Ligand binder design. Structure first.
Ligand SMILES: [Zn+2]
Ligand SMILES: [Zn+2]
Lengths: 171, 214, 576, 251, 10, 116, 10, 10
DNA sequence: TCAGCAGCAGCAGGTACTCTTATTCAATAT
RNA sequence: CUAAGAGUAC
DNA sequence: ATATTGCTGCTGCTGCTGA
């Protein structure tokens, strides 16, 4: 999958890539790269799940439906995956690069937040930092969502509090 | 003449929607006139030069027997199409005096672009004659044929009284429909008149609601 | 085991949380939203350290949307009710010809796009053709409107001398420097408008400063010492109006300073007691003593005063420039998530030094003064900045950077001073002020003996460090300052970190490159042009996260949870 | 994200080229997305030009081509070949559109599509009334004309249509033998809402048109249709994450 | 108007 | 466009219509300086700008360690080593085509295929 | 509005 | 008028 | 019977629950 | 009493 | 010597001759 992403990058840099109707060249390139990386992680996770025996305890819990999912097995055993902030890959916080350990204009999967290591194998420092950015996004989203849902729920309940079914079946 | 072709096609669609509106209002319009084909319309209401004519496109309608039995206080109706893009005061005055002298309780005016406010002010004529103005662009597509739009049926006075009696309702306790709603304009609702709305529910097959015009 | 670093006010241990703020004397350009009539705004929060220390914001705004035809640039001078056109400002500073003004703003004759975008300004300002007339125009637009006609000029001159770009100078006779800086600001604004550079990132940690106990107490004492000196005057004038003998003991009032400082440290409200409800709150907090690590993390805490109820998420997100300076996973999890941060283990904050010796060094080493700089005769010249003040230009910046680096690495220049060379932008920025957050790194040199890049530090230095540590548990002591003074390690802040290439580990990245399948997958980066090396990656974590075992085998929110939950752990907080 | 959905006429649902025709018909394109650049030159006489590049263009057009009242100032527009390629536009169409939008007040000529450079030359015809101050601002007048010719005029499509994309959906059509078979159709998704003008475009199915903006649905179709659209939007929100809520609550 | 709800005018 | 300035007071010159000779003129707005017109172009507006993509190239661009290196053919020196960077035009619709500067000749060559 | 969600206006 | 309260006219 | 334009200015912010800490001065007259 | 801060479960 | 007083959300009018 990394080789496929490299080939797509080579085509894009040679301008031979044609833009999808309705978006710019860069957006089409990013869409293709993200799709390839996501399907790579899914395929690796499917291989890992198929390998696991019926006596595997995590497999048993997933089979029962008590706890866990396929994505958890994939991330713990096969590959953590692609880290995203605001629905996009890790942005260039520095000038044209994500971290000062990469060169300028690096669009490779490892440069913009693809974590190819599982949790069992452990994360390299750059992958660790990108994962921290993603987790921070998740925490902020949860903290915003709870307050927004509380406000909306109060307003809805106040609006509809007086609606009742009467004895002629009208509401 | 691609512009002329699109103009005549749009005019034909507008004519079809106007006939459909008049038929739905409860007047005697035969089904054949509604479904008139394009070639027949071009042969009849368009000249040899290709420019459609609007003066002979106007027509008159009368209530049917069932509507007379149900609505015994409504009579003949007149529909007029104008030629000039902006209808002047003189033309509107001729239209209103013709409506008055022909004893029509309702008359629909159709215009190309706009009505000057100097004529908009005199649009409300001497009662009980009511003037309703429509735009051709707004009448190209019959909105009532959209699947989102359910069935609207105007209720008679006796039906409204029975409805309020059976449900023990006051006038204001009914759901409201504005007297500018596109279907309300289509059916010519006046304030105080109740439309029954038949809807295809998904919990029951049929659901009947009611909306009072405001 | 107690580390200090806190005050004892009324028997209570109080710690001053670091306060994050936007850096001063930096030109920042921001795009504006569609509804606003101004499209781009270039602003500088000018402030002088050795003076009134008053904040005066200059905004050079660009009116008109993209599709609009009248695109005029207007500046917002302080104490003026209207946004004066920029060309009027140049004419008031003493630059009458339009050719000179356009030379000051634009540095390239071939850049006809900028001239096309800038012509509406001179078209608008054609009505004024004289310096005295321009000063009269500014006075007429002057918001005071309480001055007679021929005395408006004095008010306009005072505005342009003491309120316009105070960080350059407050004296008279330095109009050319201020005109050059205004041209530079407008040049940056137009570069952003011309779709040549992106709008400045508000979250860039190199554009932020942390006020520690020092500056906070400094500005608090100034207000308190101003009140005392003013009170001496009212007494001196009263005791001189009554014709009585003056005694110094009666004039002074120690309760003023004492009570003000005690109240400001006892309560979070940071200022005067009557100025409460308008002063920042929560600056000083009761020191946490539940556990030792809780005390440490509290003593290394930074707060960002953005609302906390605001619904914007960008200030809270973990920025890229936070690498190695704040802990990636050590934030509170409620409404202060991301707004409250914790320093990394090895990150430091500068205390500030005097910039005059560096200015003397630059003048000695061949910096051309800005007064006699003609861009046409020197097109490819590099602009040199010191603490945000444009001091001149240099024609051979490479040799200048080489000698500055050599001076800083031998101890002649203070290691806290940060020097950045932007080759693409052709700029040289030197910062010495307080508040900058930096970290140490290994320096990598050519090493012609081995023919490849290698760390400057070798086994001899490690042996000397080990010997000194063993003796502590006689030779010349080999401490951290020994490494610093011998040019083995370096201090880099987020600004300088933009212009360097760092190796994550020395073994796998410096030398030119059957593997254990259990080991994690690592890359060689296929590039050898490194300038620095990380001392250890694990130093990106803070005090609370450094307790977690195998944090890189964990999901990140779990690490954040543990960092927050280890401060509630029960143990021995002190031995006494 | 105001978006609109268009369904084609049933008789030509699977006709891909008819879908392309409808997509081109409703999509909004202006000169701003076509013109590469604009220039203002000086020509002493409006028969032979002083620019050698369009000297070939004039030895086509001036050879092909009252002229005593034409301004010496000239406005030149360079277009993009690729923009003329990915969008179904040609030189004659844009020339006709400019001539229509600026009446007779602008003498317009356009390079033929087979020329190496797509060039349009426009002069401001001089009204027979002589002007002493408009001549001085003829540069300014031509700039104003150029400004209202870049963003204020439209080549094709209805307004508020940012971008149209075509998709292949699969609906359930009752087969002539009785069953419900999977029949594919071509459906247009549109950024921007102009329901009143899109609905009347020939070639589409006016009945089945739908919009995310239930306000537009309510103000075009009615209060009942607005209620139905509101329910559909609430249902999409609820079922976006896969949750199921009984009908009566949202109703 | 006002402001709010200058003048009119000015 | 090549805007030029007066040589008497160093003030801007505006284009002007000439009646006697029917030619473009350039006039000063304060001292009335008059001279001929070098070119007929008086106004240029780029909707799609091509220049500025290679902006920022300096004689010592190779001293920047952050810039990536490559061994691609140089069609003026046939050397391998060079520094490469993407387009400097920060418009969001620009292409991802790369630019290369040889560190021994300072010739800029792109990776484009339609251009080549 | 409000606050929150003055007035308007004021 | 004016503007405000062109001309008239222009 | 119709074509062209403008002005301004204002803060709080989901539901419960636990704990700690500090709280406005100085001068004049009876 | 007021104000401020640290929190816990969502 | 002791007590009184100095990010988010909108809202509305005035005016013709000329051509
Ligand atoms: Zn001159
Ligand atoms: Zn070369």
């Amino acid at each position: 999958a990394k080789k496929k992403v490299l080939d797509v990058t080579k085509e894009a840099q040679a301008n031979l890539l044609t833009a999808k109707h309705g978006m710019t060249l860069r957006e089409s390139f990013e869409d293709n790269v993200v799709r390839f990386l996501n399907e790579a992680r899914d395929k690796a996770g499917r291989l890992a799940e198929v390998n696991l025996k019926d006596l595997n305890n995590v497999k048993q819990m997933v089979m029962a439906g008590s706890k866990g999912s396929f994505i958890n097995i994939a991330q713990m055993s096969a590959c953590v995956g692609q880290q995203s902030v605001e629905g996009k890959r890790i942005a260039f916080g520095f000038v044209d690069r994500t971290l000062p350990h990469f060169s300028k204009d690096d669009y490779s999967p490892e440069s913009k937040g693809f974590v190819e290591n599982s949790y069992l194998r452990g994360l390299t420092p750059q992958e660790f930092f990108f994962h921290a950015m993603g987790g921070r996004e998740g925490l902020i989203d949860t903290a915003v969502k709870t307050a927004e849902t509380g406000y909306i729920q109060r307003r809805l309940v106040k609006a509809l509090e007086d609606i009742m079914v009467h004895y002629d079946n009208t509401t | 003449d691609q512009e002329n072709e699109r103009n005549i096609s749009r005019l034909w669609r507008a004519f079809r929607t106007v006939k459909e509106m008049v038929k739905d209002r409860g007047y005697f319009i035969t089904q054949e006139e509604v479904e008139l084909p394009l070639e027949d319309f071009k042969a009849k209401y368009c000249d040899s030069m290709g420019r459609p004519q609007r003066k002979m496109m106007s027509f008159q309608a009368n209530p049917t027997e069932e509507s007379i039995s149900k609505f015994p206080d409504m009579g003949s109706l007149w529909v007029e199409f104008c030629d000039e893009p902006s209808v002047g005061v003189k033309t509107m005055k001729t239209f209103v005096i013709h409506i008055q002298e022909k004893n029509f309780q309702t008359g629909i005016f159709v215009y190309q672009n706009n009505i000057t406010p100097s004529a908009m002010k005199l649009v409300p004529s001497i009662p009980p004659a009511t003037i309703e103005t429509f735009n051709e662009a707004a009448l190209v597509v019959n909105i009532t044929h959209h699947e989102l739009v359910p069935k609207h049926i105007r209720l008679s006075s006796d039906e409204k009284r029975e409805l309020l009696k059976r449900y023990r309702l006051k006038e204001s306790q009914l759901p409201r429909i504005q007297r500018a709603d596109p279907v309300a304009l289509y059916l010519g609702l006046k304030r105080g008149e109740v439309v029954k709305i038949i809807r295809k529910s998904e919990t029951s097959g049929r659901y009947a609601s009611y909306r009072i015009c405001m | 085991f107690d580390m200090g670093g806190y005050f004892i006010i009324n028997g209570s241990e109080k710690v001053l949380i670091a306060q994050e703020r936007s850096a001063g004397n930096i030109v920042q350009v921001f795009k504006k939203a569609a509804p606003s009539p101004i499209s781009h705004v270039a602003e500088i929060r000018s402030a002088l350290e050795k003076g009134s220390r008053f904040i005066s914001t200059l905004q050079v705004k660009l009116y008109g949307r993209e599709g609009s035809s009248a695109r005029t640039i207007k500046a917002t001078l302080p104490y003026i009710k209207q946004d004066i056109p920029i060309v009027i400002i140049f004419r008031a500073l003493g630059i009458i010809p339009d050719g000179e003004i356009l030379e000051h703003i634009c540095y390239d004759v071939n850049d006809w796009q900028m001239l096309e975008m800038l012509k509406p300004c001179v078209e608008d300002g054609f009505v004024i053709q004289d310096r005295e007339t321009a000063l009269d125009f500014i006075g007429r637009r002057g918001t005071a409107l309480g001055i007679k006609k021929e005395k408006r000029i004095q008010y306009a001159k005072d505005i342009l001398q003491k309120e316009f770009l105070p960080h350059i100078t407050q004296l008279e006779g330095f109009e050319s420097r201020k005109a050059f800086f205004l041209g530079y600001m407008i040049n940056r604004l137009l570069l952003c408008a011309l779709d040549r550079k992106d709008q400045d990132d508000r979250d860039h940690f190199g554009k932020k400063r942390l006020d520690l106990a020092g500056p906070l107490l400094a500005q608090l004492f100034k207000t308190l010492f101003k009140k005392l000196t003013k009170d001496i005057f009212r007494y001196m004038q009263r005791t001189v109006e009554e014709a009585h003998d003056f005694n110094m003991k009666l004039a002074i009032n120690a309760k003023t300073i004492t009570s003000g400082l005690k109240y400001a440290l006892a309560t979070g409200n940071w200022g005067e007691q009557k100025k409460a409800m308008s002063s920042r709150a929560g600056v000083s907090q009761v020191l946490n003593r539940y556990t030792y690590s809780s005390t440490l993390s509290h003593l290394r805490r930074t707060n960002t005063p953005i609302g906390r109820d605001g619904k914007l998420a960008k200030p809270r997100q973990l920025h890229n420039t936070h690498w190695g300076l704040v802990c990636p996973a050590e934030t509170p999890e409620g409404q202060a998530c991301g707004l409250v941060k914790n320093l990394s283990l090895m990150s430091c904050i500068s205390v500030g030094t005097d910039p005059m010796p560096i200015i003397t060094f630059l003048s000695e080493w061949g910096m051309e003064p800005l007064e006699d700089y003609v861009p046409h005769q020197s097109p490819d010249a590099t602009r040199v900045f010191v603490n945000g003040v444009w001091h001149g230009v240099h024609r051979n910046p490479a040799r200048l950077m080489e000698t500055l680096r050599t001076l800083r690495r031998k101890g002649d220049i203070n290691p806290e001073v940060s020097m950045i060379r932007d080759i693409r932008e052709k700029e040289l920025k030197i910062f010495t002020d307080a508040g900058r957050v930096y970290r140490p790194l290994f320096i990598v040199e050519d090493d012609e003996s081995l023919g490849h890049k290698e760390l400057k530090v070798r086994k001899g230095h490690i042996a000397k460090l080990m010997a000194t540590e063993y003796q502590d548990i006689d030779v010349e002591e080999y401490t951290w300052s020994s490494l610093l003074n011998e040019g083995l390690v370096e201090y880099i802040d987020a600004e300088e970190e933009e212009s360097i290439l760092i190796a994550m580990q020395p073994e796998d990245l410096e030398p030119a490159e059957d593997v254990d399948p259990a080991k994690r997958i690592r890359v060689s980066h296929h590039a050898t042009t490194f300038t620095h090396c990380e001392i250890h990656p694990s130093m990106i974590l803070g005090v609370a996260a450094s307790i977690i075992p195998f944090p890189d085998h964990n999901q990140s929110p779990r690490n954040t949870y543990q960092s927050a939950m280890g401060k509630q752990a029960m143990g021995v907080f002190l031995t006494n | 994200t105001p978006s609109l959905t268009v369904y084609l006429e049933p008789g030509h649902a699977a006709d891909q080229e008819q879908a392309k025709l409808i997509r081109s018909a409703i999509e909004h394109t202006t000169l701003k997305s076509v013109t590469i650049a604009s220039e203002i030159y000086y020509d002493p006489d409006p028969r032979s030009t002083v620019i050698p590049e369009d000297e070939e263009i004039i030895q086509l057009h001036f050879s092909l081509l009252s002229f005593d009242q034409q301004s010496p100032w000239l406005l030149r527009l360079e277009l993009d070949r690729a923009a003329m390629n990915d969008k179904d536009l040609t030189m004659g169409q844009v020339g006709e559109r400019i001539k229509q939008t600026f009446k007779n007040d602008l003498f317009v000529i356009w390079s033929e599509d087979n020329d190496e450079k797509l060039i349009i030359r426009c002069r401001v015809v001089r009204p027979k009334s002589l002007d002493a101050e408009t001549e001085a601002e003829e540069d300014h007048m031509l700039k104003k004309i150029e400004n209202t010719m870049l963003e204020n005029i439209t080549l094709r499509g209805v307004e508020n249509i940012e971008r149209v994309v075509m998709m292949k959906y699969d609906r359930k059509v009752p087969s002539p033998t009785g069953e419900y078979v999977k029949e594919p159709e071509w459906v247009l998704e549109t950024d921007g809402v102009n329901l009143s003008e899109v609905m009347t475009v020939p070639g589409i199915d006016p009945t089945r048109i739908y919009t995310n903006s239930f306000i537009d649905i309510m103000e075009v179709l009615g209060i009942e249709a607005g209620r139905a659209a509101l329910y559909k939007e609430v249902y999409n929100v609820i079922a976006s994450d896969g949750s199921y809520v009984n009908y009566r609550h949202m109703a | 108007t006002x402001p709010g709800v200058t003048x009119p005018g000015v | 466009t090549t805007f030029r300035f007066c040589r008497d007071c160093n003030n801007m010159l505006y284009p002007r219509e000439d009646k006697e000779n029917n030619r473009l003129l350039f006039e000063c707005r304060t001292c009335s300086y008059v001279e001929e017109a070098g070119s007929p172009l008086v106004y240029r507006h780029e909707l799609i700008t091509n220049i500025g993509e290679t902006a920022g190239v300096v004689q010592d661009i190779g001293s920047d360690p952050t810039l990536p290196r490559s061994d691609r053919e140089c069609p003026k020196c046939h050397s391998r080593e060079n520094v490469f960077f993407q387009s400097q035009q920060r418009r969001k619709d620009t292409s991802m085509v790369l630019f290369f500067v040889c560190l021994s000749c300072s010739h800029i060559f792109t990776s484009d295929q339609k251009n080549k």
